CSV table of N, CA and C and ligand atoms in Angstrom, one decimal:
chain,number,residue,atom,x,y,z
Z,1,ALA,N,24.0,-21.6,9.7
Z,1,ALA,CA,23.2,-21.0,8.9
Z,1,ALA,C,24.0,-20.4,7.7
Z,2,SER,N,23.5,-20.7,6.5
Z,2,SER,CA,24.2,-20.1,5.1
Z,2,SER,C,24.1,-18.8,5.2
Z,3,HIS,N,24.8,-18.1,4.2
Z,3,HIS,CA,25.0,-16.6,4.2
Z,3,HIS,C,23.3,-16.2,3.7
Z,4,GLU,N,23.0,-16.8,2.6
Z,4,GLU,CA,21.6,-16.3,1.8
Z,4,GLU,C,20.4,-16.5,3.3
Z,5,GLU,N,20.5,-17.4,3.9
Z,5,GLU,CA,19.7,-17.5,5.2
Z,5,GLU,C,19.8,-16.4,6.0
Z,6,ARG,N,21.1,-16.1,6.4
Z,6,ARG,CA,21.5,-15.0,7.4
Z,6,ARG,C,21.1,-13.6,6.9
Z,7,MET,N,21.3,-13.4,5.5
Z,7,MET,CA,21.0,-12.1,4.9
Z,7,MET,C,19.4,-12.1,4.8
Z,8,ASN,N,18.9,-13.2,4.5
Z,8,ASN,CA,17.2,-13.0,4.5
Z,8,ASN,C,16.8,-12.6,5.9
Z,9,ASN,N,17.2,-13.5,6.9
Z,9,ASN,CA,16.9,-13.3,8.3
Z,9,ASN,C,17.1,-11.8,8.7
Z,10,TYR,N,18.3,-11.4,8.3
Z,10,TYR,CA,18.3,-9.6,8.3
Z,10,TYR,C,17.5,-8.8,7.8
Z,11,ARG,N,17.1,-9.1,6.6
Z,11,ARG,CA,16.1,-8.4,5.7
Z,11,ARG,C,14.9,-8.5,6.4
Z,12,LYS,N,14.5,-9.5,7.0
Z,12,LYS,CA,13.2,-9.8,7.6
Z,12,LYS,C,13.0,-9.0,9.0
Z,13,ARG,N,14.2,-9.0,9.8
Z,13,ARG,CA,14.2,-8.4,10.8
Z,13,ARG,C,14.1,-6.7,10.9
Z,14,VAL,N,14.9,-6.0,9.9
Z,14,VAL,CA,14.8,-4.7,9.7
Z,14,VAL,C,13.6,-4.2,9.0
Z,15,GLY,N,13.0,-5.2,8.2
Z,15,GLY,CA,11.7,-4.8,7.4
Z,15,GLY,C,10.6,-4.9,8.5
Z,16,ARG,N,11.0,-5.9,9.4
Z,16,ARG,CA,9.4,-6.0,10.6
Z,16,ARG,C,9.4,-4.8,11.6
Z,17,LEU,N,10.8,-4.2,12.0
Z,17,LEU,CA,11.1,-3.1,12.8
Z,17,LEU,C,10.5,-1.8,11.9
Z,18,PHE,N,10.7,-1.7,10.5
Z,18,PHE,CA,10.3,-0.6,9.7
Z,18,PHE,C,8.7,-0.8,10.0
Z,19,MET,N,8.2,-1.9,9.7
Z,19,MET,CA,6.6,-2.1,9.6
Z,19,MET,C,6.2,-1.6,11.0
Z,20,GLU,N,6.8,-2.0,12.0
Z,20,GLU,CA,6.2,-1.7,13.3
Z,20,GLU,C,6.3,-0.2,13.9
Z,21,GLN,N,7.4,0.4,13.2
Z,21,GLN,CA,7.6,1.9,13.5
Z,21,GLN,C,6.4,2.6,13.0
Z,22,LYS,N,6.3,2.2,11.7
Z,22,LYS,CA,5.4,2.9,10.9
Z,22,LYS,C,3.8,2.9,11.3
Z,23,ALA,N,3.5,1.5,11.8
Z,23,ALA,CA,2.1,1.2,12.4
Z,23,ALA,C,1.9,1.9,13.6
Z,24,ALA,N,3.1,2.3,14.3
Z,24,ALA,CA,2.8,2.9,15.8
Z,24,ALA,C,2.8,4.5,15.5
Z,25,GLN,N,2.7,5.0,14.4
Z,25,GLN,CA,2.3,6.4,14.2
Z,25,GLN,C,1.0,6.9,14.5
Z,26,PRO,N,0.8,7.8,15.3
Z,26,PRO,CA,-0.5,7.9,15.7
Z,26,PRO,C,-1.8,8.0,14.7
Z,27,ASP,N,-1.4,8.5,13.4
Z,27,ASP,CA,-2.3,8.6,12.4
Z,27,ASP,C,-2.3,7.4,11.4
Z,28,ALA,N,-1.7,6.3,11.9
Z,28,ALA,CA,-1.3,5.3,11.2
Z,28,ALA,C,-2.8,4.2,11.5
Z,29,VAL,N,-3.1,3.5,10.5
Z,29,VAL,CA,-4.2,2.4,10.7
Z,29,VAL,C,-3.6,1.1,10.3
Z,30,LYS,N,-3.6,0.0,11.1
Z,30,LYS,CA,-3.2,-1.2,10.5
Z,30,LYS,C,-4.4,-2.3,10.5
Z,31,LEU,N,-4.5,-2.7,9.4
Z,31,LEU,CA,-5.5,-3.9,8.8
Z,31,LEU,C,-5.0,-5.2,9.3
Z,32,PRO,N,-6.0,-5.8,9.4
Z,32,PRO,CA,-5.9,-7.4,9.5
Z,32,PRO,C,-4.9,-8.0,8.8
Z,33,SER,N,-4.8,-7.7,7.3
Z,33,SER,CA,-3.7,-8.2,6.7
Z,33,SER,C,-2.3,-8.0,6.9
Z,34,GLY,N,-2.0,-7.0,7.6
Z,34,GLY,CA,-0.9,-6.4,8.0
Z,34,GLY,C,-0.6,-5.0,7.0
Z,35,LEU,N,-1.4,-4.9,6.2
Z,35,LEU,CA,-1.3,-3.4,5.5
Z,35,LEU,C,-1.7,-2.5,6.5
Z,36,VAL,N,-0.6,-1.3,6.5
Z,36,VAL,CA,-0.9,-0.1,7.2
Z,36,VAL,C,-0.8,1.1,6.1
Z,37,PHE,N,-1.6,2.0,6.6
Z,37,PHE,CA,-1.8,3.5,6.0
Z,37,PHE,C,-2.2,4.5,7.0
Z,38,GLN,N,-1.5,5.8,6.3
Z,38,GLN,CA,-2.0,7.1,6.8
Z,38,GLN,C,-2.6,7.8,5.8
Z,39,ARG,N,-3.7,8.5,6.4
Z,39,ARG,CA,-4.3,9.3,5.3
Z,39,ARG,C,-3.7,10.7,5.1
Z,40,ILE,N,-3.1,11.0,3.9
Z,40,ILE,CA,-2.6,12.1,3.6
Z,40,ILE,C,-3.8,13.4,3.2
Z,41,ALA,N,-4.6,12.9,2.5
Z,41,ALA,CA,-5.7,13.5,2.3
Z,41,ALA,C,-7.1,12.8,2.0
Z,42,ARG,N,-8.3,13.2,2.7
Z,42,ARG,CA,-9.5,12.5,2.3
Z,42,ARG,C,-10.0,13.5,1.2
Z,43,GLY,N,-10.4,12.5,0.2
Z,43,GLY,CA,-11.0,12.7,-0.8
Z,43,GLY,C,-12.8,12.8,-0.7
Z,44,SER,N,-13.4,13.6,-1.6
Z,44,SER,CA,-14.8,13.8,-1.9
Z,44,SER,C,-15.5,12.8,-2.4
Z,45,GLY,N,-14.8,11.8,-3.0
Z,45,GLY,CA,-15.5,10.7,-3.7
Z,45,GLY,C,-16.5,10.0,-2.8
Z,46,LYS,N,-17.5,9.2,-3.5
Z,46,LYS,CA,-18.5,8.7,-2.7
Z,46,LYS,C,-18.6,7.2,-2.8
Z,47,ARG,N,-17.8,6.6,-3.7
Z,47,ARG,CA,-17.5,4.9,-3.9
Z,47,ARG,C,-16.1,4.8,-4.3
Z,48,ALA,N,-15.7,3.5,-3.6
Z,48,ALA,CA,-14.5,3.0,-3.9
Z,48,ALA,C,-14.5,2.0,-5.1
Z,49,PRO,N,-13.4,1.9,-5.9
Z,49,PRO,CA,-13.4,0.8,-6.9
Z,49,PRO,C,-13.8,-0.5,-6.7
Z,50,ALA,N,-14.2,-1.1,-7.6
Z,50,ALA,CA,-14.4,-2.7,-7.7
Z,50,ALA,C,-13.1,-3.3,-8.1
Z,51,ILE,N,-13.0,-4.6,-7.9
Z,51,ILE,CA,-11.6,-5.3,-8.0
Z,51,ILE,C,-11.4,-5.2,-9.3
Z,52,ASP,N,-12.2,-4.7,-10.4
Z,52,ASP,CA,-11.7,-4.8,-11.6
Z,52,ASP,C,-11.9,-3.3,-12.3
Z,53,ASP,N,-12.3,-2.3,-11.7
Z,53,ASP,CA,-12.6,-0.9,-11.9
Z,53,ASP,C,-11.0,-0.4,-12.4
Z,54,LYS,N,-11.2,0.4,-13.4
Z,54,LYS,CA,-9.8,1.0,-13.8
Z,54,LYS,C,-9.7,2.4,-13.0
Z,55,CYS,N,-8.4,2.2,-12.2
Z,55,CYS,CA,-8.2,3.5,-11.3
Z,55,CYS,C,-7.1,4.4,-12.0
Z,56,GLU,N,-7.2,5.7,-12.0
Z,56,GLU,CA,-6.1,6.6,-12.3
Z,56,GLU,C,-5.4,7.1,-11.1
Z,57,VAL,N,-4.1,7.0,-11.0
Z,57,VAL,CA,-3.5,7.1,-9.8
Z,57,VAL,C,-2.3,7.9,-10.0
Z,58,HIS,N,-1.8,8.7,-9.3
Z,58,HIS,CA,-0.1,9.2,-9.0
Z,58,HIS,C,0.3,8.5,-7.8
Z,59,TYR,N,1.6,8.0,-8.0
Z,59,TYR,CA,2.2,7.4,-6.7
Z,59,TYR,C,3.7,7.3,-7.2
Z,60,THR,N,4.4,7.2,-5.8
Z,60,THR,CA,6.0,7.2,-5.6
Z,60,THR,C,5.9,6.0,-4.6
Z,61,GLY,N,6.8,5.2,-5.1
Z,61,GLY,CA,7.2,3.9,-4.3
Z,61,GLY,C,8.4,4.0,-3.8
Z,62,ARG,N,8.7,3.5,-2.7
Z,62,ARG,CA,10.2,3.9,-2.1
Z,62,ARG,C,10.3,2.6,-1.2
Z,63,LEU,N,11.6,2.3,-1.0
Z,63,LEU,CA,11.9,1.2,0.3
Z,63,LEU,C,12.1,1.9,1.4
Z,64,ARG,N,12.5,1.0,2.4
Z,64,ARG,CA,12.6,1.3,3.7
Z,64,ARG,C,13.7,2.4,4.1
Z,65,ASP,N,14.5,2.4,3.0
Z,65,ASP,CA,15.5,3.4,3.2
Z,65,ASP,C,15.3,4.8,2.6
Z,66,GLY,N,14.1,4.9,2.0
Z,66,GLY,CA,13.7,6.0,1.2
Z,66,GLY,C,14.1,6.2,-0.4
Z,67,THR,N,14.8,5.0,-0.8
Z,67,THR,CA,15.1,4.9,-2.4
Z,67,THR,C,13.8,4.9,-3.1
Z,68,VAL,N,13.7,5.5,-4.3
Z,68,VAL,CA,12.5,5.5,-5.2
Z,68,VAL,C,12.7,4.6,-6.0
Z,69,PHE,N,12.0,3.4,-6.3
Z,69,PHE,CA,12.0,2.6,-7.2
Z,69,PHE,C,11.0,2.8,-8.3
Z,70,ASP,N,10.0,3.6,-8.3
Z,70,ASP,CA,9.1,4.0,-9.2
Z,70,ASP,C,8.0,5.0,-8.9
Z,71,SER,N,7.9,6.1,-9.7
Z,71,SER,CA,7.1,7.1,-9.6
Z,71,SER,C,6.5,7.6,-10.9
Z,72,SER,N,4.9,7.6,-10.8
Z,72,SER,CA,4.3,8.3,-11.8
Z,72,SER,C,4.6,10.1,-11.8
Z,73,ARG,N,4.8,10.4,-10.7
Z,73,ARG,CA,5.1,11.7,-10.6
Z,73,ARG,C,6.2,12.5,-11.2
Z,74,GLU,N,7.5,11.4,-11.5
Z,74,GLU,CA,8.5,11.6,-12.0
Z,74,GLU,C,8.2,11.5,-13.4
Z,75,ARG,N,7.4,10.8,-14.2
Z,75,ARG,CA,6.9,10.9,-15.4
Z,75,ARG,C,6.0,11.7,-15.8
Z,76,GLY,N,5.5,12.7,-14.8
Z,76,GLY,CA,4.6,13.9,-15.3
Z,76,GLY,C,3.3,13.5,-15.7
Z,77,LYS,N,2.8,12.3,-15.5
Z,77,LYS,CA,1.4,11.9,-15.9
Z,77,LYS,C,1.0,10.6,-15.2
Z,78,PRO,N,-0.3,10.5,-14.7
Z,78,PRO,CA,-0.8,9.4,-14.0
Z,78,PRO,C,-0.8,8.1,-14.9
Z,79,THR,N,-0.9,6.9,-13.8
Z,79,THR,CA,-0.9,5.7,-14.6
Z,79,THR,C,-2.2,5.3,-14.0
Z,80,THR,N,-3.0,4.1,-14.9
Z,80,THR,CA,-4.2,3.6,-14.5
Z,80,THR,C,-3.8,2.1,-14.5
Z,81,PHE,N,-4.7,1.5,-13.2
Z,81,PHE,CA,-4.3,0.1,-13.0
Z,81,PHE,C,-5.9,-0.3,-12.6
Z,82,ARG,N,-6.0,-1.8,-12.6
Z,82,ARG,CA,-7.0,-2.3,-11.8
Z,82,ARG,C,-6.5,-2.9,-10.5
Z,83,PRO,N,-7.5,-2.7,-9.8
Z,83,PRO,CA,-7.0,-3.6,-8.3
Z,83,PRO,C,-6.3,-4.9,-8.6
Z,84,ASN,N,-7.0,-5.9,-9.7
Z,84,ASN,CA,-6.8,-7.4,-9.6
Z,84,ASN,C,-5.3,-7.4,-10.7
Z,85,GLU,N,-4.6,-6.3,-11.0
Z,85,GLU,CA,-3.5,-6.3,-11.7
Z,85,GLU,C,-2.3,-6.0,-10.9
Z,86,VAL,N,-2.4,-5.3,-9.5
Z,86,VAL,CA,-1.5,-4.7,-8.8
Z,86,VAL,C,-1.1,-5.7,-7.7
Z,87,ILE,N,0.0,-5.5,-6.8
Z,87,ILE,CA,0.3,-6.4,-5.5
Z,87,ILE,C,-0.6,-6.5,-4.6
Z,88,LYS,N,-0.7,-7.3,-3.8
Z,88,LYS,CA,-2.3,-7.4,-2.7
Z,88,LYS,C,-2.2,-6.1,-1.8
Z,89,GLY,N,-1.1,-5.5,-1.6
Z,89,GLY,CA,-1.4,-4.5,-0.7
Z,89,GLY,C,-2.0,-3.3,-1.2
Z,90,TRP,N,-1.8,-3.1,-2.7
Z,90,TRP,CA,-2.6,-2.2,-3.4
Z,90,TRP,C,-3.9,-2.6,-3.7
Z,91,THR,N,-4.2,-3.9,-4.2
Z,91,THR,CA,-5.6,-4.3,-4.4
Z,91,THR,C,-6.2,-4.1,-3.1
Z,92,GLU,N,-5.8,-4.4,-2.0
Z,92,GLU,CA,-6.6,-4.1,-0.8
Z,92,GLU,C,-6.9,-2.4,-0.5
Z,93,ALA,N,-6.0,-1.8,-0.5
Z,93,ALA,CA,-6.0,-0.5,-0.5
Z,93,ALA,C,-7.1,0.2,-1.3
Z,94,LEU,N,-6.8,-0.1,-2.7
Z,94,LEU,CA,-7.7,0.6,-3.7
Z,94,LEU,C,-9.1,0.5,-3.4
Z,95,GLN,N,-9.3,-0.6,-2.9
Z,95,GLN,CA,-10.8,-1.0,-2.8
Z,95,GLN,C,-11.1,-0.3,-1.5
Z,96,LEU,N,-10.5,0.5,-0.7
Z,96,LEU,CA,-10.9,1.1,0.5
Z,96,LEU,C,-10.7,2.6,0.3
Z,97,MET,N,-10.4,3.2,-0.8
Z,97,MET,CA,-10.2,4.3,-1.4
Z,97,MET,C,-11.3,4.9,-2.3
Z,98,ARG,N,-11.4,6.3,-1.9
Z,98,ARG,CA,-12.6,7.0,-2.9
Z,98,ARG,C,-11.7,8.1,-3.7
Z,99,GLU,N,-12.4,8.7,-4.7
Z,99,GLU,CA,-11.6,9.6,-5.5
Z,99,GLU,C,-11.3,10.8,-4.6
Z,100,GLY,N,-10.0,11.1,-4.7
Z,100,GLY,CA,-9.5,12.3,-4.1
Z,100,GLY,C,-8.6,11.8,-2.8
Z,101,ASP,N,-9.0,10.7,-2.3
Z,101,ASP,CA,-8.2,10.2,-1.3
Z,101,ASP,C,-6.7,10.3,-1.6
Z,102,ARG,N,-5.8,10.3,-0.7
Z,102,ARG,CA,-4.3,10.3,-0.9
Z,102,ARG,C,-3.8,9.5,0.3
Z,103,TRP,N,-3.2,8.5,0.0
Z,103,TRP,CA,-2.6,7.6,1.2
Z,103,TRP,C,-1.1,7.2,1.3
Z,104,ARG,N,-0.7,7.2,2.5
Z,104,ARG,CA,0.6,6.6,2.5
Z,104,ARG,C,0.5,4.9,3.0
Z,105,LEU,N,1.0,4.1,2.0
Z,105,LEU,CA,0.7,2.9,2.3
Z,105,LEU,C,2.1,2.3,2.9
Z,106,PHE,N,2.0,1.2,3.7
Z,106,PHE,CA,3.3,0.7,4.2
Z,106,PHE,C,2.9,-0.8,4.1
Z,107,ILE,N,3.7,-1.4,3.3
Z,107,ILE,CA,3.1,-2.7,2.5
Z,107,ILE,C,4.1,-3.7,3.2
Z,108,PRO,N,3.7,-4.9,3.8
Z,108,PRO,CA,4.7,-5.8,4.3
Z,108,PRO,C,4.9,-6.7,3.1
Z,109,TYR,N,6.2,-7.5,3.1
Z,109,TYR,CA,6.7,-8.0,2.1
Z,109,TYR,C,6.0,-9.0,1.5
Z,110,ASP,N,4.9,-9.8,2.4
Z,110,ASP,CA,4.1,-10.8,2.1
Z,110,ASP,C,3.1,-10.4,1.1
Z,111,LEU,N,2.6,-9.0,1.3
Z,111,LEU,CA,1.6,-8.4,0.4
Z,111,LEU,C,2.3,-7.5,-0.7
Z,112,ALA,N,3.5,-7.9,-1.1
Z,112,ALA,CA,4.1,-7.1,-2.0
Z,112,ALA,C,4.9,-7.9,-2.8
Z,113,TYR,N,6.4,-7.8,-3.0
Z,113,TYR,CA,6.9,-8.6,-3.9
Z,113,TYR,C,7.7,-10.1,-3.1
Z,114,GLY,N,7.3,-10.1,-2.0
Z,114,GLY,CA,7.5,-11.4,-1.3
Z,114,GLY,C,8.8,-11.8,-1.1
Z,115,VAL,N,9.2,-13.2,-1.2
Z,115,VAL,CA,10.4,-13.8,-1.2
Z,115,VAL,C,11.5,-13.6,-2.4
Z,116,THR,N,10.7,-13.5,-3.3
Z,116,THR,CA,11.7,-13.1,-4.6
Z,116,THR,C,12.2,-11.8,-4.8
Z,117,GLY,N,11.4,-10.8,-4.4
Z,117,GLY,CA,11.6,-9.4,-4.7
Z,117,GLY,C,11.1,-9.0,-6.3
Z,118,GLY,N,11.4,-7.8,-6.8
Z,118,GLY,CA,10.9,-7.6,-8.0
Z,118,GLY,C,11.7,-6.4,-8.6
Z,119,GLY,N,11.8,-6.5,-10.1
Z,119,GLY,CA,12.2,-5.2,-10.7
Z,119,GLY,C,13.7,-5.0,-10.6
Z,120,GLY,N,14.4,-5.9,-9.9
Z,120,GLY,CA,15.9,-5.6,-9.7
Z,120,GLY,C,16.2,-4.8,-8.5
Z,121,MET,N,15.2,-3.8,-8.5
Z,121,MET,CA,15.6,-2.8,-7.2
Z,121,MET,C,14.9,-3.2,-5.8
Z,122,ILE,N,14.0,-4.2,-5.8
Z,122,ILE,CA,13.1,-4.5,-4.7
Z,122,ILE,C,13.7,-5.9,-4.1
Z,123,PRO,N,14.6,-5.8,-3.1
Z,123,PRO,CA,15.4,-7.3,-2.8
Z,123,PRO,C,14.1,-8.2,-2.0
Z,124,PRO,N,14.4,-9.6,-2.0
Z,124,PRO,CA,13.7,-10.3,-1.1
Z,124,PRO,C,13.2,-9.7,0.2
Z,125,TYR,N,12.0,-9.9,0.8
Z,125,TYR,CA,11.5,-9.6,2.0
Z,125,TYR,C,11.5,-8.2,2.2
Z,126,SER,N,11.1,-7.4,1.3
Z,126,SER,CA,11.0,-5.9,1.5
Z,126,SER,C,9.7,-5.3,1.8
Z,127,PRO,N,9.4,-4.5,2.9
Z,127,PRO,CA,8.4,-3.9,3.2
Z,127,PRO,C,8.3,-2.7,2.1
Z,128,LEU,N,7.1,-2.2,1.4
Z,128,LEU,CA,7.3,-1.1,0.6
Z,128,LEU,C,6.5,0.2,1.1
Z,129,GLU,N,6.9,1.6,0.9
Z,129,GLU,CA,6.1,2.5,1.3
Z,129,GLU,C,5.6,3.3,-0.2
Z,130,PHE,N,4.3,3.6,-0.1
Z,130,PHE,CA,3.9,4.3,-1.4
Z,130,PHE,C,3.1,5.4,-0.8
Z,131,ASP,N,3.2,6.5,-1.7
Z,131,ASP,CA,2.3,7.6,-1.6
Z,131,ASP,C,1.5,7.7,-2.7
Z,132,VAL,N,0.2,7.3,-2.5
Z,132,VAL,CA,-0.9,7.0,-3.7
Z,132,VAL,C,-1.9,8.1,-3.6
Z,133,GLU,N,-2.3,8.5,-4.6
Z,133,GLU,CA,-3.6,9.6,-5.0
Z,133,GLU,C,-4.4,8.9,-5.9
Z,134,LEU,N,-5.5,8.7,-5.4
Z,134,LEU,CA,-6.7,8.0,-6.5
Z,134,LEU,C,-7.4,9.1,-7.2
Z,135,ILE,N,-7.1,9.4,-8.4
Z,135,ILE,CA,-7.8,10.6,-8.8
Z,135,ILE,C,-8.8,10.4,-9.6
Z,136,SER,N,-9.1,9.2,-10.2
Z,136,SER,CA,-10.4,9.0,-10.8
Z,136,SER,C,-10.5,7.6,-11.1
Z,137,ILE,N,-11.8,7.1,-11.0
Z,137,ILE,CA,-12.3,5.8,-11.2
Z,137,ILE,C,-13.0,5.8,-12.3
Z,138,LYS,N,-13.0,5.0,-13.5
Z,138,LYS,CA,-13.4,4.8,-14.6
Z,138,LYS,C,-14.8,4.8,-14.5
Z,139,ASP,N,-15.8,5.5,-15.0
Z,139,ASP,CA,-17.2,5.5,-14.8
Z,139,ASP,C,-17.9,5.4,-13.2
Z,140,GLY,N,-16.8,6.1,-12.5
Z,140,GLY,CA,-17.5,6.2,-11.2
Z,140,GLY,C,-16.9,5.4,-9.9
Z,141,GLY,N,-17.0,4.1,-10.4
Z,141,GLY,CA,-16.4,3.1,-9.4
Z,141,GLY,C,-17.6,2.1,-8.9
Z,142,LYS,N,-17.6,0.9,-8.8
Z,142,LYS,CA,-18.5,0.0,-8.7
Z,142,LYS,C,-18.2,-0.8,-7.3
Z,143,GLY,N,-17.5,-0.2,-6.6
Z,143,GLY,CA,-17.3,-1.0,-5.2
Z,143,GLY,C,-17.8,-0.4,-4.1
Z,144,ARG,N,-17.1,-0.5,-2.8
Z,144,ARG,CA,-17.6,0.0,-1.8
Z,144,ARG,C,-18.4,1.4,-1.7
Z,145,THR,N,-19.2,1.7,-1.0
Z,145,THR,CA,-19.7,3.2,-0.8
Z,145,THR,C,-18.7,3.7,0.2
Z,146,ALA,N,-18.7,5.0,0.2
Z,146,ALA,CA,-17.9,5.8,1.4
Z,146,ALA,C,-18.4,5.3,2.8
Z,147,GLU,N,-19.8,5.2,3.1
Z,147,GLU,CA,-20.0,4.8,4.2
Z,147,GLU,C,-19.6,3.5,4.6
Z,148,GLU,N,-19.6,2.5,3.7
Z,148,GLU,CA,-18.9,1.0,4.1
Z,148,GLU,C,-17.5,1.2,4.3
Z,149,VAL,N,-16.9,1.8,3.5
Z,149,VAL,CA,-15.5,2.0,3.7
Z,149,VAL,C,-15.1,2.6,5.0
Z,150,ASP,N,-15.7,3.7,5.4
Z,150,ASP,CA,-15.5,4.3,6.9
Z,150,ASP,C,-16.0,3.3,8.1
Z,151,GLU,N,-16.9,2.7,7.7
Z,151,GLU,CA,-17.1,1.5,8.9
Z,151,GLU,C,-15.9,0.5,9.0
Z,152,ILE,N,-15.5,-0.1,7.7
Z,152,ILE,CA,-14.3,-0.8,7.8
Z,152,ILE,C,-13.5,-0.3,8.8
Z,153,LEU,N,-13.0,0.9,8.2
Z,153,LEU,CA,-11.7,1.6,8.8
Z,153,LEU,C,-11.9,2.0,10.3
Z,154,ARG,N,-13.1,2.3,10.7
Z,154,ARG,CA,-13.3,2.7,11.8
Z,154,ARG,C,-13.3,1.4,12.8
Z,155,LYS,N,-13.9,0.3,12.4
Z,155,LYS,CA,-14.0,-0.9,13.1
Z,155,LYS,C,-12.5,-1.5,13.1
Z,156,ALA,N,-11.7,-1.3,12.2
Z,156,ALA,CA,-10.3,-1.7,12.0
Z,156,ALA,C,-9.6,-1.1,13.1
Z,157,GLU,N,-9.8,0.1,13.2
Z,157,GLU,CA,-8.9,0.9,14.4
Z,157,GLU,C,-9.4,0.3,15.6
Z,158,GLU,N,-10.7,0.1,16.0
Z,158,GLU,CA,-11.1,-0.3,17.3
Z,158,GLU,C,-10.4,-1.6,17.7
Z,159,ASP,N,-10.2,-2.5,16.6
Z,159,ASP,CA,-9.6,-3.7,17.1
Z,159,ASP,C,-8.0,-3.9,16.8
Z,160,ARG,N,-7.7,-2.7,16.9
Z,160,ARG,CA,-6.0,-2.9,16.6
Z,160,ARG,C,-5.2,-3.8,17.5
Z,161,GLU,N,-5.6,-3.9,18.6
Z,161,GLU,CA,-4.9,-4.7,19.6
Z,161,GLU,C,-5.2,-6.1,19.5
Z,162,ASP,N,-6.4,-6.3,18.7
Z,162,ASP,CA,-7.0,-7.8,18.4
Z,162,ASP,C,-6.3,-8.2,17.2
S,201,LIG,C1,2.5,-2.6,-14.8
S,201,LIG,C2,1.9,-2.7,-13.1
S,201,LIG,C3,0.6,-3.1,-13.3
S,201,LIG,C4,2.6,-4.0,-12.6
S,201,LIG,C5,2.3,-4.3,-11.0
S,201,LIG,N1,2.8,-3.2,-10.3
S,201,LIG,C6,2.4,-3.2,-9.0
S,201,LIG,O1,1.6,-4.0,-8.6
S,201,LIG,C7,3.3,-2.0,-8.3
S,201,LIG,C8,2.1,-1.5,-7.2
S,201,LIG,C9,1.4,-0.4,-8.1
S,201,LIG,C10,2.4,0.6,-8.8
S,201,LIG,C11,3.3,-0.3,-10.0
S,201,LIG,N2,3.9,-1.0,-8.7
S,201,LIG,S1,5.5,-0.8,-8.6
S,201,LIG,O2,5.8,0.3,-8.7
S,201,LIG,O3,5.6,-1.7,-7.2
S,201,LIG,C12,6.4,-2.0,-9.8
S,201,LIG,C13,7.7,-2.1,-9.6
S,201,LIG,C14,8.5,-3.1,-8.7
S,201,LIG,C15,9.9,-3.1,-8.8
S,201,LIG,C16,10.5,-1.9,-9.2
S,201,LIG,F1,12.0,-1.9,-9.1
S,201,LIG,C17,10.0,-0.9,-10.0
S,201,LIG,C18,8.7,-0.9,-10.1
S,201,LIG,C19,2.6,-5.7,-10.7
S,201,LIG,O4,3.9,-6.0,-10.4
S,201,LIG,N3,1.7,-6.8,-10.9
S,201,LIG,C20,2.3,-8.1,-10.7
S,201,LIG,C21,2.2,-8.6,-9.4
S,201,LIG,C22,0.9,-9.0,-8.8
S,201,LIG,C23,0.8,-9.4,-7.6
S,201,LIG,C24,1.8,-9.7,-7.0
S,201,LIG,N4,3.2,-9.7,-7.3
S,201,LIG,C25,3.1,-9.0,-8.7
S,202,LIG,NA1,10.7,5.0,3.0
S,203,LIG,NA1,-10.9,6.0,2.2
S,204,LIG,NA1,8.2,-6.3,-1.6
S,205,LIG,NA1,10.4,-8.4,-1.3
């Protein structure tokens, strides 16, 4: 095995251990895609964004070792994204969040920057950790209802072992 293969095998191994350890947290929820989240706060909003709604958020992104690769909080002002403009783990999570929700997201590499990595700071095969707060959705949000979301999340917890 070449060095690159051995290095990426290592990256995949420790990344998978990280994902497993975070999914085993009692308040963590694992979704079928592989996305894991913990609720930091439950918002009072009643609608999740649609795939093309503009979401105002505060976030901090960290690698498995805690290194911060990007943070709107450090910039002192929120950032606005649509779900269809962001990595797959965020696209999925945002459509399951309502205004005021604050989540810790644990994103496996295949729902993040994948085999190439990104930004110079995220190497190949990196899981990512985000603390994300959904502050507002432009014009209220045209996605799932709070009740639709909660059923998905309830049912997701039920079928964890499946
Ligand atoms: C301007 C922004 C809309 C772009 C967007 N950003 C993100 O989706 C993530 C999550 C949301 C917060 C922002 N970040 S981030 O903080 O992780 C970026 C980052 C990475 C590495 C680093 F070193 C520093 C920062 C992006 O990349 N989309 C392209 C794409 C889509 C699907 C698959 N792959 C790539
Ligand atoms: Na971390
Ligand atoms: Na939610
Ligand atoms: Na990644
Ligand atoms: Na990566």
